[PDB]
Structures are given as C-alpha cells and as structure tokens.
Symmetry: D2
Subunit: 299 residues, 4 copies
C-alpha cells in the first residue's frame, strides 16, 4: 500500500448467482475491468457490497476470491464492519491470511454513544487487528459522526492510516481535513462520487466511488483533472458523473435505488450478475429498460 | 405452548464470561430463578439479550443451552432477527431442532420502505420457517412501523401467532389492539415493563419485561393484579416497577444504561456475570456504586 | 381553578371563516356544546387550534372571544408557545387581562439541547408570567424532552401547576408521573385520546382530548369510568374512541389528517366551520363524504 | 437586482441593545463595514439574524433600518419565513415599501409532506408577493428537502430567481446544480462558509456567509480566487476561513456557539453590540476572553 492511499478506490459490488452464492465469473470480469481501467485499489464488503445482508460464509468467499483474483496487482481493502466485534476481528484475520493490505471499520449501527466511548472502542479493537485500519464514518446509522478531534486522537496510533467519509456533509469533511492538515500521510477519502471532484480540488486524497465499478476510466480521469485543477476537464467530466447520478441511481420505486441501478447496469454492460440479495430484489424488465436507456444516453 | 401466549415472558440477558464466552452456570441460575419466580415463557436473543452484538457461535450456544436447561418446563421463544435472512433462517432451524416453541422476527433495520414490502418480506420468510412466528415491532432503527392493517393481513397466515411491540407508543399499540380485536387467539405482547400494567388492563396478553430477570415475582404479581383489575395492588406494584426503572436503568448516561444496569444488578444479586460485550464500555466504579445503592434501597 | 385540574379539557379547534377570519358564531356554538357536555376546562391555541399557522391577530382574537364566551363558567387555559419569548409573554398578558386562568408553554424547537437549558428557560420565563403555568412537551420538533427530574425541579416554583404530554410515549409519561407523585397539587394531563383511559387508570388527572370537540359526553364518560375503574364501561367506551380514531382521523392523503377530519366532522355535526388555514386546506367533497359516512357509522 | 445574484451576500446579525431593542448605531457601522468590504448584497433576518427568536416588531425594525441605511447602494434580501403565511406576506409587503429587492422563503417546518405539496405552497404564495423570491432549504426542521425536479419546476415562475442551500450536503447541492444547469440566470447560493470555495469552484454563484459580518474582504477574496480558479490563493484563504470556523464558532458549550461567537467577535472588533436575545445570552467574561485570544491569533 502507498502512503497516503490516493486515487479512485471502487467499492466493489458483491456479484451473486443467488442469495447465498457468489458470482465468481462476474467477480473476475469486474476486477479485470477495474484493474485495466487504472483504479488504485479494490474495496470489498462496503455498503455497495451488501455486506450486512450477506451470510458469513459468503462474506468470507468474497474476501478469499477477491484476494486470489487480484493476485497482488493492487492493494485490497476489506471492510470489516459488523454488528459483532468478534466477527469483525475474524474477517480482519481472514483478510490478513489471504493477503489483503488493510481493513476498513465503522462502528456498529446501534452504537450510539459519546466520543469517549468511540475512542475506547477503537483503542480496544486496534490491538486485535493484523492489518492497518481506515476509519469509516457513515453517520445515518449511529446518528454520531467521528468528531474531528476524535479522528486526530485515534490517528495517533500508527495502525490507523486513513479515514473514509460517507457523509455527504462537506462542512464536516473540511473540518476533519483542517484537523488532520499536519498529518499529510493520513489518507482522507470521500465516498459519494458527486463530491469527489470538489473534495479532491481541496486536497482530499481520493474517492471510494461506486460508479467506478461501471466506468473506471471516467472517475480516474476526473480525479486527475481535479488533482491538477484542469477546470475545463473537471466541469466536462463532473457533468457526466452527475448525469449518471441522476439517471442510473434514481429508478427504484422500492428502496436501494443506487445498488439496484448499479448492479443492473453492470449486468447490461456484460460485467457481472445483477442478482441482489434478499430481502431486496433485482430490477425486473420495466426498470431494467430504463437503466438501458439511461446508459445509451450517457454514451 | 398456550394460545394466546400470556403473562410474563422475560427477555433473558445473555450472560457472558467474556466477549465470546457464555456464562453457562449463570444462565442456569437465571433460568431456575425465572422458573421459580412464576414466569410463563422464556424469550432469548432479544435486545435485552444483546443478540446483534454477539457472534453467530454465541447466539447458537445461547439457544442450545437455554433449550437444554429449560427441559420443556416452559415455552422458549427465540428471536431470529438478523441483518442476513440466511443466518436468520439458520437460527430458526437450530431453535426447532433443540425444542423451542416459536420464533420472533423483526425485518432488518435497513429494510422496509413501506407496507407492501413489509408484507412481501414475511410472505417470503414464512415458508422457510419451521416454527410459529411472532412479529416484532422495533421502530428505533427503521422509522417505519407495521401498520395495523399490515398486521391484520400477515396474521391471517396460520404460521403467525402474535405481535410484540417495543415502541413505547401506546397510541400505536391501541391501534393494533383495535385492528386485532376479532382475533382473540393472536397474542399481543408489550416489551417495556413501565407500561405493562396499563396495557394488560386494556387487554394486552403479556409483558416481555427485562426487569423480570431481576425480580420475576414483582412483574408476575403486577400482571395478575392488572388482569384482575385489582387497582390498589396495580398502583402499589406499579410504583416499585417505576422505582426500578428510575434507579437501575438510568446510570449509564447512554441509551445502553438499561442493559449495563440490569446486568450489573444481576451480578450483585449473585445470579450471573455482569459483563456486557464489546463495543460497549463497562461500568466503572462510580456507576456500579449507584446500582449497588439502588439495590440497597430495595432491600437487597 | 381546581387544584389539581382534572377531567376532560378539550383543545379547542380555532374555527375559521377564512385564513385570517375567526368563525365567532361557530366558536360560540362549540363552547356551549362543550360546557353542556360536562367538560372541566377549555384549552385554546393548542396544536388542535392551529396556533402556529395563525396570525398574531387571530391568536389574540381566539383568546379574547373564548374568554368572553366562557364568561367564567369554566377555567380557560391558553397556549402561549411561540418562537419569540416577547410574543409569548404578550399572549400571556392578554390572556390574564381577559380572565384566563392559566397558560401553557413548551420551549421552542431550536432551543433545547440539554436539561440545564430547559431549567434556565423556565427560571427566566416564570417571573414574566401573570398566570399559573402548565409545562408541555412539544410533540414533534424538539430532540429533547423534559426529563422527569427537570420537571420536578421546575415545579419547585409555585407558579408551575402541571404538565401535559402530547408524546404518545407512555413509558415517558409513567416516568414523569412517578417523579411528580408526591406533589399532590400537580396536574398530569395526557393529550392523545387513545391512551386517556389507561393513563387515568394509573393516576393521570385528565385528558386534553381533541375528539371531545365532537363528542364531549363520550370522553367525559370514559374519564369517569377510568377514574372509578368500571372496567366494562372502560372497555365499551374505549372501543368507541378507537373507532373514531380509526375512521375520522385517517382520511387525509396530504398530511394533517387528524385536524382536517376533526374540523370536517365538526361542520357536518353543525357546530362550526370546517375551514383550515393555509398552507393546509379542508377536505374537498371526495374526502368529506367519507367523513360523513364514517360519522353515520358510529 | 443583478441577474444572477453573485458573490458574497452576508446574512447580517440583528444587532441588539436588549432582547427587544435594536442597536441602530451598531447596525449602521455593520452595514458601512460590509459595503466598504466589497460584499454584493445584504441578507436580513436569516438564522444568523436570529429571526425566529425576535419579536415581530424587532424583525420589522431590522428591515426598515437596513433599507434606510443601505440607501440603494446594494441589493437588500429579506427573509420572510414564518409559521404564519399571513405574517410572512406582511413582512414581504413591508420589505417592498421600504425598497428591498427580494425576499427569501422556506416553507414552515411542519408543512411539507411531499414534493407535490411544496410546489403547491409556492404556487399559492407567489401571487401574494410583491418582490422576486429566493427559495431556501431549511437546515434542520423540515425533514423533507426541495427535490431537484421540484426546484426546476418552481423556478419556471418568473417571480422565483434563486435558491440558497444551508444543509451542508454537497451531494444534494450538486444534484440541484445539475438540474438547474440550463438556467444560468437562476442564482445558486451556499450558506455554510466552509464549503463556499469548493462550491464556487464548481460554478455556484455565491456564498451567504456569516463570517463576512467580521471580515468581508477575506470572504470576497476567497470568492474571487474560487471564481477564477486561483488555486494557491484558494488554499491560503480556505485555511484562514477554516481557522475562523474552528476557533471563533466553537467556544460555547452549545449549538448556539456560532452566533454567540460571531456576535462576541463583532463587539470586540468595535462594530456592534454583542447582545444575544433570550432565550440565549451573550458570552460572559471567560468566553469573551477566549474569543479575543482567538481573534488575536487570526490577526
Ligand atoms: Na395467524
């Protein structure tokens, strides 16, 4: 792993044949498509990867297979978030055993607590982990953000090397950048792709952007444009990312519109299965048709 | 397994010697204490049982040990809620194999947009279950409740036999009571013990009350007084229940003060280990001191 | 003014002829209907009264007319809640000048982050008020409820005589009842009519029940049956209340289904105008016809 | 007045001598300070102006004095949001009679169920207003945003000329930019100052930034550097903005710390009274001491 991890780091979907069956052939296709597209690392079992909805055995298979297929060509980050900390540590050990480079952890959804309790949780977790850690802020779930100073503090431990934000809240994100400005080796990553460009312009290291599963070259181009402040390219490419956001992710009449749209598009592009794990369901033909048309209108 | 299941149905704590180690001897003492205290069933892996936060292995051990120790003396209800439907169904099958009488299920936190999907979720789930099911309304995470009409509809399935609510919202609970009033065999249970008495007075079948881990006799006596509308006795005992609620469940400074306080008291009562699994930080001395004091004020 | 205030205390709708015009004749009829139905006090400018949606002028007119019409026959409670403390104290002073007996206040949404601030809010407001005060827990907006210990502490002031909860959370309500049980002059009132009976059974003093605008005698009868633990009557009458709840309050597709249903019924019953103030609007005929039908089926 | 309204548009504090008494002399000093500082408009009775917590009388005095003092030198925008539509329309008419240029409106917190109802709210409001309107997305209360398509739709009305976002969610803001990209005349403004630079870089028209009460030149300079993509200067000035945010707005033990700090700083700077209306109260000696230290550490 490069210090600081930078660039586009797609959160892989977990392609499925069935609720409890990994689509290994499509995983292979996806990973080659990403690598050939110039992405900088692979991120497995994120939200985009349906981690929580999958069985334990299937999560282990996604890790093992991703590590096998990638064959050291790129760093692999494994999201170890789990309601059970024991199970979280076990995923971390699996990851180390199969050659992953780092783990990624958000506190459990039910862990609505104060900051001192967040700090103590991580202080007790870190000794148990065999790989460097990225902290994962996904606020909806806890109703509690890592406070900037809390990130400062946990980032003292040399086993903590970065931070991924999936708040779309950029006031919060800039507050953490400011708090971390004297530790420039600490990787500051942004989840939502719609704000990757503007965040990178202001010094964010990279984007953990789900749309890069589809069009890795687009997101890598936009990242580089933003990095070098080529403003005409930033504007032209941002409009494409935004068209995708408005057209590929908004078809659901039943929830998880982003995940269903992404997975449908991946199947339409011939990359991997669009099977979505229960209790959710893949797009049927009407919605799928809309995703087809949206895809043709991007070009 | 009485239809409708009624009375006091404690949500057992899952006693732990360590994050991943079941306190078997403490579980045995707890169960005997509950049985001798007159409760009508045992409910495992509820919120009180920390189910989300335990490993798969430990959840299974809780189920297996509880069924073994109960020895058929009381119905055992197993909460099978999980973020993964496959793990959920596995837990149900494990429960059936080990002699449990029913399962209890809430849809996963991240799930229900609306009512028609709630209906579908259960329509898909039911054919996979080997035991009768109680629906569990736990709206804290997923802002959407089961609408009254939704419960009516799901309850038509002969494999759905009741409903447990842990909203403390009794306007909602009364709305479901009215919707289900022509199905007197469908068990309507209330979680929070502070509203058990008033709900049973108005026809609820029982209370899934955590305090009964500590003092099963108090909740059983209150349930019976409510059932019989012995108002003097209802008021006398309701005060003790509220005292326990104000002094045992409020120490943490966190929403999870209830669990930490309850397990702390159970250890101070000699029943089982007080240990709460990570991620939760243990009570330090000042907090344990308040629990000890609250218990001394109740004559322990 | 009976201490503790008890029984049925309807939150009067504010009857309107237009967005900024009071329906005075309807208000007169409503008050006569409530008094004849045996209610024990009148509560104006509650959420049932559309307070926040009305102009200052119309809030003042409702206070003035309600007091004139009641002519001392029943205690009048006025909700003074407002985002401006100055405006809230102005409503309190007007209420006093026109013969109201008490004021009712919730802290504004934006203010409450903690218990110490709620204490300080009331410590600062109380010396400005010319009438006794009921505290109330703002139903939706706020993140922060009055903690039971905070209510104990605020009620150390003799100018604080009660608490009304519009949360439908009876665990919370029981926690407050328990903290206040040893103050015999302190009135504990429950807003939502669906839980009035069970709460009175366990010692609540009364109900601030919107349905009593339509059928005051029914809610009074249920209150007395609960108060006296006549369980057969409690059950019989609770079922009628729940039927109202299921059928009169559930017709709206657009929000504020309770208020639009209630006002629609009041007009169909011949009591007062159904007009609802902008930005909301009264039911049009498709929905009104359903309320009519539901009424015919009680 | 200028279409689209652009630049720095400070949400003025409402300077007070007491809970219900306007500090007229402070307000004059404040407005002269903003004008000389190069701002492009004045926005009165926003959140920063404490509108909700002030009496109707005081809100009217703020409007009247602000228009009198500005003397046509700069557009005046007036927040007319109120739980009562009758009261809101009355403030708009008062604004018009005193020569304000536009009104700013959010729907009342309780109201919005859905998008169709937001549209109808504005359809009924618009014929009643005597000035052009800016829509604004209420930061905390509503729990239902203007969807992008909703903004497109309301913006067809010639009486609606802009949009101000205070949410701090830049995924959402970029979604609305994308929806409004074919109507360049429609003014798109961001409230929170910490993300003004990044939003302007990507084409936002302006910043309704409270910190501009204290240091108008700094925010105008940052706006211009973002506008022209002068990146070295964006970085230099963003660091100062983030220092103000970290050190002036964080002294309270409260959510109120932004307002108390801003007003304390304004007083220490000789501009206007620091008085804060009940139920809040201005910083006493200790906190005031900390704010002064913070100010000396900026410069
Ligand atoms: Na059934």
């Amino acid at each position: 792993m490069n210090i600081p991890l930078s660039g586009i780091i797609p959160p892989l979907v977990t392609p499925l044949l069935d609720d409890d069956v990994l689509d290994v052939e499509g995983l292979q296709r996806l990973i080659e498509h990403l690598i050939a597209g110039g992405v900088h690392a692979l991120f497995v079992l994120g939200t985009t990867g349906e981690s929580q909805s999958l069985s334990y055995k299937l999560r282990m298979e996604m890790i093992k297979n991703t590590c096998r297929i990638a064959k050291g060509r790129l760093p692999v980050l494994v999201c170890i978030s789990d309601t059970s900390i024991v199970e979280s540590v076990n995923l971390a050990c699996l990851a180390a055993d199969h050659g992953a480079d780092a783990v990624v952890s958000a506190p459990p959804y039910y862990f609505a607590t104060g900051q001192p309790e967040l700090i103590e949780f991580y202080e007790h977790l870190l000794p148990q982990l065999p790989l460097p850690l990225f902290l994962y802020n996904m606020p909806t779930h806890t109703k509690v953000n890592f406070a900037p100073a809390t990130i400062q503090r946990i980032a003292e431990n040399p086993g903590v090397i970065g931070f991924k934000d999936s708040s779309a809240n950029t006031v919060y994100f800039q507050s953490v950048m400011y708090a971390m400005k004297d530790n420039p080796d600490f990787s500051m990553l942004v989840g939502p792709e719609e704000i990757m460009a503007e965040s990178v312009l202001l010094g964010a290291h990279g984007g953990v952007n789900g749309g890069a599963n589809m069009f890795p070259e687009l997101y890598v181009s936009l990242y580089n444009a933003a990095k070098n402040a080529d403003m005409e390219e930033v504007r032209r490419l941002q409009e494409k990312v935004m068209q995708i956001s408005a057209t590929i992710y908004t078809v659901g009449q039943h929830g998880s519109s982003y995940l269903k749209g992404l997975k449908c598009a991946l199947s339409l592009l011939g990359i991997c299965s669009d099977y979505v794990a229960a209790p959710f369901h893949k797009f049927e033909q009407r919605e799928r048709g809309k995703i087809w048309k949206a895809l043709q209108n991007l070009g």
